[PDB]
Amino acid sequence: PVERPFSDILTSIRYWVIHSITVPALFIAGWLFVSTGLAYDVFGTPRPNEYFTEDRQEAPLITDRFNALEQVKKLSGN
Amino acid sequence: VYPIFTVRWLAIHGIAVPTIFFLGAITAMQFIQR
Amino acid sequence: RSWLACSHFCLGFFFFIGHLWHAGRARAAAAGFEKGIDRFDEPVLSMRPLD
Amino acid sequence: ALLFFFGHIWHGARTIFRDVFAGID
Amino acid sequence: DKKLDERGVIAKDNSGRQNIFPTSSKAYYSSP
Amino acid sequence: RASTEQTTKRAMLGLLAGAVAGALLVAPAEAIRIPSHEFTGGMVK
Amino acid sequence: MLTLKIFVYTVVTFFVCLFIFGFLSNDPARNPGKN
Amino acid sequence: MARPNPNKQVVELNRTSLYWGLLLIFVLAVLFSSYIFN
Amino acid sequence: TIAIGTYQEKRTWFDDADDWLRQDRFVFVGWSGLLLFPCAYFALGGWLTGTTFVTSWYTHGLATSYLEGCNFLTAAVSTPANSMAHSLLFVWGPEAQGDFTRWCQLGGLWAFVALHGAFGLIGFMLRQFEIARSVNLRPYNAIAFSAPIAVFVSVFLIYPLGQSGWFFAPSFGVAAIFRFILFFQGFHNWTLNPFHMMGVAGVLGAALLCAIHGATVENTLFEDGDGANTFRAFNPTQAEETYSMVTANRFWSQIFGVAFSNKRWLHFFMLLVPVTGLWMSAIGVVGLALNLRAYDFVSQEIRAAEDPEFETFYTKNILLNEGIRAWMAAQDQPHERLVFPEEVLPRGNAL
Amino acid sequence: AGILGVLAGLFHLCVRPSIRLYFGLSMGSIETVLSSSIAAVFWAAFVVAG
Amino acid sequence: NSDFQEPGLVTPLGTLLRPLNSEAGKVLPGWGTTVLMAVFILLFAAFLLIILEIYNSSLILDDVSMSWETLAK
Amino acid sequence: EVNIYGLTATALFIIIPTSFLLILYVKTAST
Amino acid sequence: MEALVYTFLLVGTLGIIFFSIFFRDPPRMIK
Amino acid sequence: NSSLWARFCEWITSTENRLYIGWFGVIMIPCLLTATSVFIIAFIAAPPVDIDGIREPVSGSLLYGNNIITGAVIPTSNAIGLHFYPIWEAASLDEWLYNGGPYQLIVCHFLLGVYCYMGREWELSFRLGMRPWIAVAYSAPVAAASAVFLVYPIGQGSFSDGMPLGISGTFNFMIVFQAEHNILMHPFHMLGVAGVFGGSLFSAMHGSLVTSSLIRYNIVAAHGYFGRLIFQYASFNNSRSLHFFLAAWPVIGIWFTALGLSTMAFNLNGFNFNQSVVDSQGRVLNTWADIINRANLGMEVMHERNAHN
Amino acid sequence: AVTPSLKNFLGSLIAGATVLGGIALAITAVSKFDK
Amino acid sequence: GLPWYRVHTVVINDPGRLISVHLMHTALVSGWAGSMALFEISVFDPSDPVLNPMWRQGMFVLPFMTRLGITQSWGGWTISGETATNPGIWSYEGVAAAHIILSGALFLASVWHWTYWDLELFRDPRTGKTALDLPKIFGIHLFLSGLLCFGF
Ligand code: CLA
Ligand code: CLA
Ligand code: CLA
Ligand code: CLA
Ligand SMILES: C=Cc1c(C)c2cc3nc(c4c5[nH]c(cc6nc(cc1[nH]2)C(C)=C6CC)c(C)c5C(=O)[C@@H]4C(=O)OC)[C@@H](CCC(=O)OC/C=C(\C)CCC[C@H](C)CCC[C@H](C)CCCC(C)C)[C@@H]3C
Ligand SMILES: CC(C)=CCC/C(C)=C/CC/C(C)=C/CC/C(C)=C/CC/C(C)=C/CC/C(C)=C/CC/C(C)=C/CC/C(C)=C/CC/C(C)=C/CC1=CC(=O)C(C)=C(C)C1=O
Ligand SMILES: CCCCCCCCCCCCCCCC(=O)OC[C@H](COP(=O)(O)OC[C@@H](O)CO)OC(=O)CCCCCCCCCCCCCCC
Ligand SMILES: CC1=C(/C=C/C(C)=C/C=C/C(C)=C/C=C/C=C(C)/C=C/C=C(C)/C=C/C2=C(C)CCCC2(C)C)C(C)(C)CCC1
Ligand SMILES: CC1=C(/C=C/C(C)=C/C=C/C(C)=C/C=C/C=C(C)/C=C/C=C(C)/C=C/C2=C(C)CCCC2(C)C)C(C)(C)CCC1
Ligand SMILES: [Fe+2]
């Protein structure tokens, strides 16, 4: 009912035990998220060898609103 | 003093967990030959 | 030459600022009011008004 | 419209805080 | 300075300047 | 082609990141909070 | 214009000498503190 | 012609307010005159 | 009669919710929190995600992301393409069709961040009002914040709404904002607008007031401490003020000519200058939203055209704007499909 | 809208505000109505301009 | 003052309209009809969203064409 | 006489507020 | 004609500044 | 005590004058009065000045077809460079006007006047018992003006690169300076912008809290509002530390921006991220820095004349 | 006819109602627990 | 001693003076409408309706009259470029004159309500102090506004 101070948790053992094993899990999760290439697929960021398609040799252009989904699918090469 | 999962806990974690995740992601990005 | 000029201009400017600061403080401390106005004999209160 | 947004803010503040602005109970 | 009068005029509000405020009407249920 | 070329530096950096983050997040919060207890502990509203 | 140059030099020298002799006239002793 | 209104105060403008107003109007005129004249 | 006071009825769910929200903890939630904390949170999140993974390749033809090899200065969350003129770019909207990847590629993250940030600003202003009401204070901070929220609303919503689409709104980044600034200089002559002049005066005067007030207060302090450090010679429960108003007034009346003699008026002036400046800037940008720009000085243009042997700094600024526009439009507006040959690009040696 | 207005008007002639709403919005003061009306004309100004 | 500084002027229209400005301050107990107000506010918000999305081309309906070309019917 | 309307606008903007402020100052100074 | 207007406006601003500096109402409120 | 020199010293140092003079005063007052007189006279009725030294004069006076916004005092001709160019060294008064001497006169006298103003601030603070560190605060605008008017021309090599004493002249100076050095990406200009914006923020917020607190408590009642509004409990609990922070933020920001301008005078530069992102095969992917570079290149191409007759 | 955009908009209405209900239930549950 | 920006607050309590003030504002706005109508009619050039329409001549209030049915004029011309034979009571000049007459009538009513500010209508039977029943006033005004909207 008094919202325990931060000093008490700092000296606690359960807090350190949980965090020393959980924070590295998040760090490795992010490292693997970027390394395995899942970031490119999820966020649509092209890989350094996919910026320019075989048929396209210039920056893409949407030039279409209600069919923008198909336009982006075609431009991205997928 | 005893209860956990308070508003302070949620406020801290909501900005702490993604921060660690993104730090890992950026550190991984650093080591890209490109 | 560019590095030398830039660095030493910056250092000279900061050291002129330091001269201002330390000269002012030294003169005030010699006068005896480097810590503030006395609050019992304010010199301003002993001057004609409507300066 | 923008000026009247500011006016709305000011007059709502002077409504909700009537007692504080008037310095009464 | 309190007692802003029935006209809402306060000689010196918390700003130290004269001002006028509306007289809020209190609420009842039935009344006579 | 884009792919991480470092194998084991990930864990070494993650351990340090977590160890530093724990302390660095608990300490300033303590410093800011103690005055919050002081203010909201008898003279509030 | 020699006359203009001489006049400006005279004015500047007069003002600069006035300033220098002003700060040499026991400046630090004229303050409202007593020390 | 019915009854004097109790809610009758008077506007008051000290000298500093006068100077502020004159400065504001003259500075605005300085800023906007070139644009008004084109 | 049957009179009544305040809170003389049975309690309700609203009372319990209000009591819980307005407690005394590390973070004051309040009712406004329900609108502020989520929205603002997502905004920040969006931006960070936007600046870390997503790309603006398909919107601007640029690469703005840490995953693509950009700094903190060059990364940004770019605005959508000009084809999506004013579409709110919902994830479920006809453009994205519910696809998150294509939504990110189309630039919807910018709209996400902008809208959630606007509602976060609303929530923050309501939070300031609620705090002031809780502590029985006049909410002048609410007006002081009404200034920046007006600036944000103008620049980030009214300007793109009056233009061809969101594409011309600022993109959330450092270099992006620099591009926005140079674009205004080239296309609108924003420096010559009287309203940006008023805003510049307000902001610079606010900085001047801050510096002068701090220096004057720290250099007219009352000696109420033996130690040579004057910061410990003060406690919050003091009775008298910690600086001599009379001495400061005399000093600034003898050095400058005029000086303050009222703490309330001085601090209200400090509050007033920036708010007025930013409101004037907002009005100017609202004018620009409709391309109602201060550009002409028709008499100067006529005189310059009549005889080439008449050059003022205004004419040089006009030529610089022509250069900026001509050399930027090729890449800053890819949807125009502009190909300027080197022959027609404006140049100084061609004058 | 016209018809609804009429109906709404009838309601507002025959139903008194709740005490909680009366004190929450300070319906006894003439300044709250000014704030609300300024907001309404503000909204209408954007709508017509757009 | 007595009766707020003596009674005011009396006019036929004043007496006719007096009932409409007599019961000032009367309120209902509790929350009254605030829930209905909330329901109507929510419905109005939905209506405003519908019209905004129709006029923003974020909600394409069959009947509406949303362009100047609809002026030819 | 160039831009008669501009001159009129400037003169009115300088006169009406100035006259208003001076009248108010004179009226209050009598107190 | 424009030059005269600009000069008059600038002279008026300078005169207002001078009057505010020298013919100000005395600050006895706090002094 | 009754000597004429003693009486003159007493009058100069007397605190009973409506405006304090002091010895810094006896130096500055002629300097600033000369500067303002020459500035007014040239702004109203100066003839065109050959800024670029290619016999293409630039008009900047009100009589010669200008208004308040577009008027200015044109800097000295590029032919003169850094040479001292008083009236008595020009062949004739007309040539002195043509080359642009009044700018040099005004700038020199103005710089001396502002330095002596900084001195007399301290002098009066000393004669009144105040602490002496208002001159330190004023040194920031003085440093910035010194940079813009003397140090940039020194590094570049000519007084024609100084800021014209005008409005549109100031905008032209900024645009050219961005074209040549890319100021926007320099960290010191970023610090200056941060200082200015933060100073505005702090002025507005300090005024808000103090005005709210002042009733008919100045720091113990308002601190409850700010401690929970944006957290930061016990951030500035002292009326002295808070005001020192107010004084320190903008002053340091402006010091840094002035130093950045001087370094650009000696021409290091702002940042330069041109072509900093490349894909496989070596193709260049544009960033916002590249668009900024295109704008800079356009500005630069317009600034240079090259072909001069 | 019920166009796909209309269906998506109705789904958005449902989702926003769900979010508001979630916030309301959270505050209700915690307030009841603490009082 | 009210400041210059708190002056009109002297009308914040007595409803009669508030009514007078609002009548004055209404009269001013109506007079502006009529005056601009007259000015634009004096400046309007109706010879060419194809290459010299209203919007090219800077007209502001003329299109707002035309949008609702005012076409003809007492000068014999029409916004169509044709010529009108029986303009009728409702023309541009007629509308402007009507607005001016309304402005004057509202001015007279404003001065009347300013003089006779103390009316029994503004004092509630209980507590005999000035008060407005804002909810019921709003109900009446909303009823009238809805009726007018439906009629239009
Ligand atoms: C040889 C020269 C010299 C000497 C011996 C001193 C000696 C002293 N000074 Mg002075 N001073 C100098 C130069 C000098 N100063 C200059 C050039 C400046 C201008 C900035 C100042 C400004 C200054 C102030 C404003 C104050 C002093 C104070 C002091 C005293 C305490 C030392 C201190 O600040 O704590 C130790 C210092 C620190 C913990 C600060 C370290 C962090 C610094 C600011 C940044 C680190 C450098 C950074 C990387 C470079 C950035 C700039 C770069 C572009 C070059 C001591 C008597 C203080 C005092 O008590 O006066 C009586 C005081 O208030 N001095
Ligand atoms: C429905 C509209 C409406 C109404 C009825 C009021 C009524 C009132 N306001 Mg509010 N206000 C409004 C809109 C409105 N205001 C808007 C849109 C803004 C934003 C700018 C404000 C901002 C505002 C502030 C900041 C304050 C008030 C105050 C007041 C009160 C005193 C009037 C005043 O300022 O002194 C009379 C003012 C003058 C005689 C000066 C007039 C000079 C102006 C600035 C220039 C000339 C205007 C021009 C001739 C006509 C413009 C027309 C345009 C509106 C289309 C009064 C109750 C004051 C008050 O009581 O609070 C303590 C106060 O402090 N109002
Ligand atoms: C209070 C917090 C809050 C606020 C103000 C907003 C506000 C917004 N969000 Mg965010 N959002 C939030 C929380 C919030 N969100 C949370 C917690 C999440 C995570 C789950 C998200 C996830 C999210 C995404 C992923 C997106 C948004 C988007 C939006 C925007 C579109 C709003 C919209 O159409 O929603 C719907 C609004 C309503 C449903 C209004 C309520 C109306 C009720 C339901 C009426 C019901 C009455 C009746 C039954 C209806 C009858 C009609 C019919 C059924 C017969 C808007 C700026 C979108 C956007 O514009 O991004 C660019 C977007 O893409 N938000
Ligand atoms: C002396 C030089 C100078 C100065 C002082 C200014 C001053 C100004 N200019 Mg600039 N300008 C100049 C030269 C200058 N200009 C030149 C030469 C050009 C070239 C034409 C421009 C082009 C220009 C443009 C294009 C614009 C300005 C704008 C502005 C105003 C900015 C207001 C503001 O704070 O917005 C920034 C503040 C906000 C947007 C408020 C939002 C704040 C949110 C709520 C905070 C978010 C929370 C955040 C995550 C917390 C993190 C904190 C962390 C950073 C520490 C201000 C009056 C802008 C303006 O106001 O127009 C209306 C604008 O759009 N100017
Ligand atoms: C660069 C300009 C600038 C910034 C960044 C800024 C920032 C801030 N000022 C605040 C306050 C204020 N500012 C004030 C006056 C002023 N502020 C000014 C200029 C600024 N003020 C000026 C010029 C004035 C004078 C009028 C006042 C009076 C206040 C306050 O009371 C308040 C405070 O308490 O300060 C301590 C805070 C508001 C917190 C917030 O967003 O609520 C939460 C809402 C959020 C987070 C939603 C915002 C989401 C945004 C719009 C989306 C984009 C976010 C990305 C990070 C964008 C990155 C962009 C790249 C270019 C970097 C914040 C620290
Ligand atoms: C021929 C000639 C004449 C040539 C002229 C050519 C030419 C270029 C003309 C100039 C044109 C010109 C005037 C341009 C400016 C026009 C312009 C843009 C106007 C802006 C107007 C405007 C409405 C802007 C809105 C924003 C606004 C309100 C800004 C206000 C700016 C402002 C006045 C800032 C304050 C400045 C200032 C110096 C304050 C110092 C105050 C001071 C002395 C405090 C000291 C002090 C501190 C203490 O702490 C205490 C305790 C005490 C006691 C005390 O005293
Ligand atoms: C009930 C929602 C629970 C949370 C869902 C997960 C949230 C995180 C979403 C991350 C992005 C993943 C893609 C989701 C997007 C997605 O996949 O949508 C898809 C879904 C259905 O579309 P379909 O895929 O069936 O459409 C396919 C074709 O028929 C299209 O023509 O759209 C909806 O029905 C609305 C969903 C809203 C989901 C967002 C919830 C928030 C709504 C806004 C709340 C406003 C509150 C306002 C309060 C005043
Ligand atoms: C997905 C998404 C979402 C959400 C999101 C979020 C919510 C996010 C968050 C996020 C976050 C929450 C993030 C964070 C991040 C962070 C970071 C990224 C950080 C960084 C840092 C740094 C980088 C630092 C640096 C430094 C320092 C300060 C220390 C030392 C020094 C230096 C400078 C190095 C949703 C579903 C709704 C929708 C869609 C989108
Ligand atoms: C400047 C400007 C402005 C404003 C303006 C205004 C506001 C105006 C107003 C105006 C007005 C407000 C006007 C009015 C007019 C009026 C009139 C003109 C009237 C007339 C009347 C008459 C004529 C009457 C008659 C009569 C009567 C009395 C009744 C009986 C019968 C008779 C018929 C005899 C602003 C700021 C916005 C900005 C822009 C511009
Ligand atoms: Fe202060």
Residue numbers in the entry:
A (entry chain E): 5 to 82
B (entry chain F): 11 to 44
C (entry chain C): 411 to 461
D (entry chain B): 459 to 483
E (entry chain 3): 35 to 66
F (entry chain 1): 24 to 68
G (entry chain I): 1 to 35
H (entry chain L): 1 to 38
Copy out sentences from the published article reporting this entry, exactly as the authors wrote them.
To understand the functional roles of TEF14, PRF1 and PRF2 in PSII repair, the structure of the PSII-M-TEF14-PRF1-PRF2 (PSII-TPP) complex obtained from the PSII-M fraction of the high-light adapted pph1;pbcp C. reinhardtii cells has been solved at 2.6 Å resolution through the single-particle cryo-EM method. The complex is composed of a partly damaged PSII core monomer and includes all three identified protein subunits, namely TEF14, PRF1 and PRF2. The identities of the three protein factors were verified by the consistency between the cryo-EM densities and the amino acid sequences of the proteins identified through mass-spectrometry. Meanwhile, the PSII core region contains four major PSII core subunits (D1, D2, CP43, CP47) and 11 small membrane-intrinsic proteins (PsbE, PsbF, PsbI, PsbH, PsbK, PsbL, PsbM, PsbTc, PsbX, PsbZ and Ycf12), whereas the peripheral antenna complexes (LHCII, CP29 or CP26), PsbJ, PsbR, PsbW and three extrinsic subunits on lumenal surface (PsbO, PsbP and PsbQ) were all absent in the complex. Notably, the three extrinsic proteins of the oxygen-evolving complex and the Mn-cluster responsible for water splitting are all missing according to the local features in the cryo-EM density map. In addition, the DE-loop between transmembrane helices D and E of D1 (E226-T245), which is a candidate site for D1 degradation, is not observed in the cryo-EM map either. TEF14 is a soluble protein binding on the lumenal surface of CP47. PRF1 is a small membrane protein with one long membrane-spanning α-helix located adjacent to CP47. The amino-terminal region of PRF1 occupies the same stromal-surface binding site for the long hairpin loop at the amino-proximal region of CP29, whereas the transmembrane helix of PRF1 takes up the binding site for Chl a603, Chl a609 and Chl b607 in the membrane-embedded domain of CP29. Therefore, binding of PRF1 to CP47 will most likely prevent CP29 from binding to CP47 of the PSII core due to steric hindrance. PRF2 (uniport ID: A8HNG8) is the other small single-transmembrane-helix protein associated with the damaged PSII-M. While PsbJ is absent in the PSII-TPP complex, PRF2 takes a position adjacent to that of PsbJ on one side of PsbE and PsbF.
